[PDB]
Amino acid sequence: DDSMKSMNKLDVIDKQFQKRINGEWVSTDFKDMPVNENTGEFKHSDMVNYANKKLAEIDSMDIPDGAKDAMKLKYLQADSKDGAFRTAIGTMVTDAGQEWSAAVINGKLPERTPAMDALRRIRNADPQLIAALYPDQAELFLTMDMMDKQGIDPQVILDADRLTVKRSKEQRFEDDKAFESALNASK
Amino acid sequence: ADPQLIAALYPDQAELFLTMDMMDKQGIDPQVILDADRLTVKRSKEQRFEDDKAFESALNASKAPEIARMPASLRESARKIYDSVKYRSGNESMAMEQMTKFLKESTYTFTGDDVDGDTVGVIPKNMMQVNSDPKSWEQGRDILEEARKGIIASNPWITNKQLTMYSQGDSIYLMDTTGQVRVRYDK
Amino acid sequence: AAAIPIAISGAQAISGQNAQAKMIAAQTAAGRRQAMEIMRQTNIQNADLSLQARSKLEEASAELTSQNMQKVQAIGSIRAAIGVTEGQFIREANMVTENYRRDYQAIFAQQ
Amino acid sequence: AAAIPIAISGAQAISGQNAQAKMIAAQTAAGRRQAMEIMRQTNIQNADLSLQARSKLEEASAELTSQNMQKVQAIGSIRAAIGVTEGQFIREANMVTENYRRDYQAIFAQQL
Amino acid sequence: QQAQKGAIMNSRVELNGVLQDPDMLRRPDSADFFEKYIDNGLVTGAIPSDAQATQLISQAFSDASSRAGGADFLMRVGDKKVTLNGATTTYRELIGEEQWNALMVTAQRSQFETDAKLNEQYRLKINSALNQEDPRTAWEMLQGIKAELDKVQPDEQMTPQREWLISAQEQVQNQMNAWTKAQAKAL
Amino acid sequence: RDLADERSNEIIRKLTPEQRREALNNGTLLYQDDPYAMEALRVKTGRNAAYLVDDDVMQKIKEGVFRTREEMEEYRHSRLQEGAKVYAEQFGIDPEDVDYQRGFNGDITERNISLYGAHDNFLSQQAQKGAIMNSRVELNGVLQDPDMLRRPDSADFFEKYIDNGLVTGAIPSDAQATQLISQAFSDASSRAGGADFLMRVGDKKVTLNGATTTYRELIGEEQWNALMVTAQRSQFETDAKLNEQYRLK
Amino acid sequence: LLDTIGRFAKAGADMYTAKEQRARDLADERSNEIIRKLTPEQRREALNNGTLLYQDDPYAMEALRVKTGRNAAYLVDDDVMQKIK
Amino acid sequence: ELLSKVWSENQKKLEEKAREKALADV
Amino acid sequence: FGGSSDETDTEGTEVS
Amino acid sequence: FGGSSDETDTEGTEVSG
C-alpha cells in the first residue's frame, strides 16, 4: 500500500517541481501538495524520497554527463532553501569535505574518491552557485580548483594541511589582524 | 546496529565512539589515530581552562542551528568530541567539523517553511524515535511537523516565526514565542 | 675518429624519422583494428542504441572511412547509385592515356 | 625499429584480452568446483539445517543452475514431468531442417 | 549421503530453474509441472526425505512469491493435491492458511513492484530521449522506441506505453520549434 | 559389482512404492540401493551435466567468439565429452552408465535447436552490423563534403541510394533506415551544403513500413524547419569563416 | 575444386565435414533459391521480422560483400595515397 | 528574478523576429 | 573543419 | 533482477516457554 501511495505522490511532486522549473513559482510544502485520494497525506519523508530518486534518475539517464550536471543544478536552483535537493547536494558537499579531511588525517589520498568526483562534476557544471549555496566549504572548493584547474599535486597540499594543524589560538588572532591589514592596504 | 542509543547510554565513552566512527565510517587509518593519541595531548589543566573557554567561544561564534541551539545531552557529548579532536589534531577546524558532523547525524533541525522561519528547533533524533528501530525517528519527525503545522493553522495569530521546538530531559516541547501554547511530546 | 660515432647517431636519427613515418601508418592500422573491435562489441540492433552506442558506431565508421580518397569514393558511390569500354571512356574523359599518363594531344585540342 | 616492440606489445595486449575472455570461463569453472565442494562438505541429513547450511546449499544450487540455457532447462523439465521420432517432430515444430538450418519453405508457406 | 546430496542438488536445480523464471511461472503448465514433479519425486524415490520434500516445497513457494508471475502460479497450485505424510492435502492445507495468505500478499507485492520497475525503465528511456541536448537526436531515439513498441505490440493502441510515446513525440515537436528559434537567433 | 547391485535391486523391487518410500525415510533402506531412485538421480545428473557446464559455456562463447558453425561443432563435441566425465566424477556417478548417458542426451535435439539458432542469430547480427557500417561509410563520404552536397545530382543520389538499400536488402530494417536518413539530414545541415541538398531532397520520396511519402513528410515539418534553419546557419558560418581566413591573410 | 584445396590448405587432417561442406553448399543454394521466390516486398517484410535472418538473403549479402570489398580497396589506396603525398 | 524577467522578455521578442526573418529567407 | 557546431540553447526539463 | 526482496518486518523477541 505504501509503495502504491509513494509511487503516486512522487509523481505529484515531480509535476510540481516541473512547474517550478518552468517558472511557475509554486510551493514545495507537502501540505500544499494536491491530494487525489490515491496519494495519501504527504508526510515530509516523501520530499527527501523524491529528491533522492530524482537525483538517481538524473544520474541514470542516457544523456551526456554534462546535461546530467545541468539538470542537477536546475533541480537545485528551484527549492525552498529547506528543499531536499539543497539538503542532498549539501550532503554531497559535506561528504566530499569529509573525504578530503580523512585524506589529510591519513596523510594520503584515498582511491576512487567517490564524493570528490561527484562534487567535482556538479561544481564544474557551475562553480559560482555551488560556492554560493555552500560558502562553508570554501576551502574545499579552493582545494579542488588547486588540484584540477591548477596543476598542484594533491600530495603537496595534503602534506601542507597535515603540517598546518597547530591553530595556537593566538596565531588565529594574529591571522585576523594581519588579514584585516592586508585588505585595508590592498588598493 | 544503533549508534545514537549506545552513545546516549554511555556518555563517558564518547571519545571511544568517536575514534571507532572515524576508523569505520570515515576512512581514517587506525595507526594515525593511535600515534596521534600517543603523541601530544600533554598540555594539561592550565590550558584546559582556555580550552573550556574556547569551547564556549566557538559555540558563541558558531552561527549554526545545531551548535547555537545545541540540545542538552548532546552538549556534553559534543564537548567531549570537540575536546578529543582538538587534543589529537590541534586543529580547531577539525574539532568543529567533527562536532558539527556528530550533531547533524544525531539531530534533526526543524525549519520554518517560509522565506525565513528557519530553525524553529533542533531536536535530538532519538527523542522523535518510535519503536526500537533507529531509522524510525522519521515517523516521529512527521508527527512533530504535522503538529507544528496544526498549531500554526489552528491559531492564526501564531506565525511560522513564533514557534519554538526544544527538548527537555525526556520530552519535546513545541511552543510559540508567548507561553500560551505549549504541547509536550514525550517518548 | 669521433666523427664516425656522431655520423652513426645522425644516420640513426634519420632512421628514426623514417621510423616515425612508419609509426604513423602503424597507428592508422591500430585505429582501424580498434574500430572493428568497436563494431564487434557494440549492438546496433533493437533500434534503441544507447548514446554511447551511437558515438561508438559513428567513430568506428569514421575510422573505416578513408579521408584521402574521400572525394573519389563519394563520386564512385554517386556513379554506382545513379548508373574496358567504361574504363577507357572515363580515361578519355580524364584526358589520360592507357599507361595513366597525361594525354597532351587530347588536352591541347586547340593547337 | 621502434615500431616493432610497440606492435608486439599491442598484439600481446590483444592476446591478454583473449586471456581475459578465457579468465571468465576459468573462473566460472572454478566457481562450479567450489560449489561442488560446498555440496560435498555440507551436511543435508535430518533436513534440520542452519542458515549457513541453507545459504551454502542455495549458493551451490545457483552455481549449478545454467543461466544461458535456463529457459531450456525449464521447458525440458516441464516436458519430462508432464510426459528419433520426437526430435523430428519438435524440429518440424521449430521450422528447422535436419542440419539445423532454418526451413524457409515451411516458414514462407503462406507467401509461397 | 552422497547420493542424497546429489538427488537434492538435482531437484533444487531443476525446480528453481523452472520457478525463478516469471515467464515460466505465468504458464498453466507451470502449476501442472509443479504438481507432477513433486509427485514423481516422491514416487521415484527422488526428494528422499518427506522432510526434504517439505523443505523443497517451502523454498519453491518462497521463490515463486518473489517473482513477477508468482501470484498466478500460487493461485493455480493452491488447489493441487499432494501426499507428504500419511494424509493427503492440497498445498493450501500443507502450507499454513496464514502462511498461504502471507505468500499470496508477498507475491502480489512482488508483481506490483516488478510492473512498477518496468514502467520506471520505460519512462526512463522516454525521458532520457526527451532531455537530449540536440532535439533531432531526441527524435531519433523516439523513433527507435517506436520501433521497439511496433515489434512487441503492433496491433494494439492507446496502451500506456503508446500514450507516453505520443506525448514524447509532441514534446519533441515543441523542442523542434524552440531549437529553430534558437538557431535563427544565433544566425 | 553391478551384477551384485542388480540382484539386490531385484530383491528390493518386490516392494510397493509406498513401503519402499517409508523404508527410504527409515534407516532400513540405503539410498544407493534403491534402483528407481538411483536411476532418477543418474538421469537428472546427466541431464544437468549436458545442460549446465557444456551448454551455458557454449552459449557464452557463442555470443562473442565463434566465427563459423564448424568451429562451434568441434568445440561443442570436445566440451561435451570432457564435461560429461568431470561432472560425473564430481558426483558419485561414473560416466559409463546407461542412465547417465541417456540423461546426457536427454534433450540433445532441443538443445541443438537453441544453440544453432543462437549462432545463426549471431551471424545475422554480424552481417547487419557490417551492412549498416558500410552504409554509414558511403553516406558519410557523400554528405560530409560541402562540395558533394552542392552537386545537382546529390539529392537524386540520396533518394536512389536509400531506395536501393531498401530493395536490395542493405540498410536492414526500416527503423535503421530512419536512423540513417535522420543522421544524414543532420550531417548535411551541418556541412555548408545542406541548404541546396535539403531543398532538393525535400520533394524526393521514400518508402518506409507505413507508406510511401516525401522526405519532408517523413521528417517532422517542424523538424524540417529546424533542419533548414540550422543548414542556413551552417552555410553562413562557413562563409564567414573562410572570409575571415582570407581577411586574416 | 576450390573447396577441396581450401580444406587441404587450412588444416592438415581430421576435417570430416567435406561431404557435409558440399551438402551445406547445396543447402545454401536451395535456401537462396527459396528466398528469391519471394517478392521484394515479401522479402523486406521477412527481413523486418526475425524470419529472413539476413544471412540467407542473397541480395543483401551480395550487396554487403560488394560494398565491403570496395571500401577495403579504398582503404588500401588511402594508405597508398597518404604515402604518395 | 527581475533580471531574468527582463532578459527573457527581450530574448523572446528577438527570437521571434529572428525566426520570422530566417524562415522568410529560407 | 567543415562541420559547424549547432548553437547551445537553454533547455527546460521535460517529462512525458 | 527477477526477484523482488521482501520488505522488512519489525523484529520481536519470542520464547517457546
Residue numbers in the entry:
A (entry chain H): 375 to 561
B (entry chain G): 499 to 685
C (entry chain T): 4 to 86, 101 to 128
D (entry chain S): 4 to 86, 101 to 129
E (entry chain M): 188 to 374
F (entry chain N): 64 to 312
G (entry chain O): 41 to 125
H (entry chain H): 686 to 711
Cite, word for word, the article reporting this structure.
The bacteriophage T7, Escherichia coli podophage, has been employed as a model for the investigation of the DNA packaging and delivery mechanism among tailed phages and related dsDNA viruses. The tail, connected to a unique vertex of the head by the dodecameric portal gp8, consists of the dodecameric adaptor protein gp11 and the hexameric nozzle protein gp12 (20, 24) surrounded by six trimeric tail fibers gp17 (16, 22, 24). The core is formed by the core proteins gp14, gp15, and gp16; upon virion adsorption onto host membranes or the receptor rough lipopolysaccharide (LPS), these core proteins have been suggested to extend the tail channel and form a trans-envelope channel for genome delivery into the infected cell. In this study, using a 300 kV cryo-electron microscopy (cryo-EM) and defocus refinement with Z-height correction, we provided improved structures of core proteins at a resolution of 3 Å, the portal–tail complex in mature T7 at a resolution of 2.7 Å, and the portal–tail complex in LPS-induced DNA-ejected T7 at a resolution of 3.5 Å.
The core in mature T7 is formed by a four-fold gp16 ring, an eight-fold gp15 ring, and a less-well-defined eight-fold spoke, which could be formed by gp14 (23). On the basis of our improved density map, we identified eight copies of gp14 between the gp15 ring and the portal helical barrel. We also modeled 112 amino acid residues (4–86 and 101–129) of the 196-residue gp14 protein. Each gp14 molecule is composed of five α-helices connected by four loops. The longest helix α1 and a shorter helix α2 in the gp14 molecule enwind the portal barrel, bridging the portal barrel and the sidewall of the cylinder formed by gp15. Helix α3 traverses through a hole on the sidewall, and helices α4 and α5 bind to the outer sidewall of the cylinder, which is surrounded by the genomic DNA. Intriguingly, only eight copies of the gp6.7 loop II were resolved to interact with the inner sidewall of the cylinder formed by gp15. Thus, gp6.7 serves as an adapter for coordinating the symmetry mismatch between the dodecameric helical barrel domain of the portal, the eight copies of gp14, and the eight copies of gp15, thereby stabilizing the core proteins on the portal. We speculate that the eight copies of gp14 are to adapt the symmetry–mismatch between the twelve-fold ring of gp6.7 loop I around the portal and eightfold ring of gp15 during the core assembly.
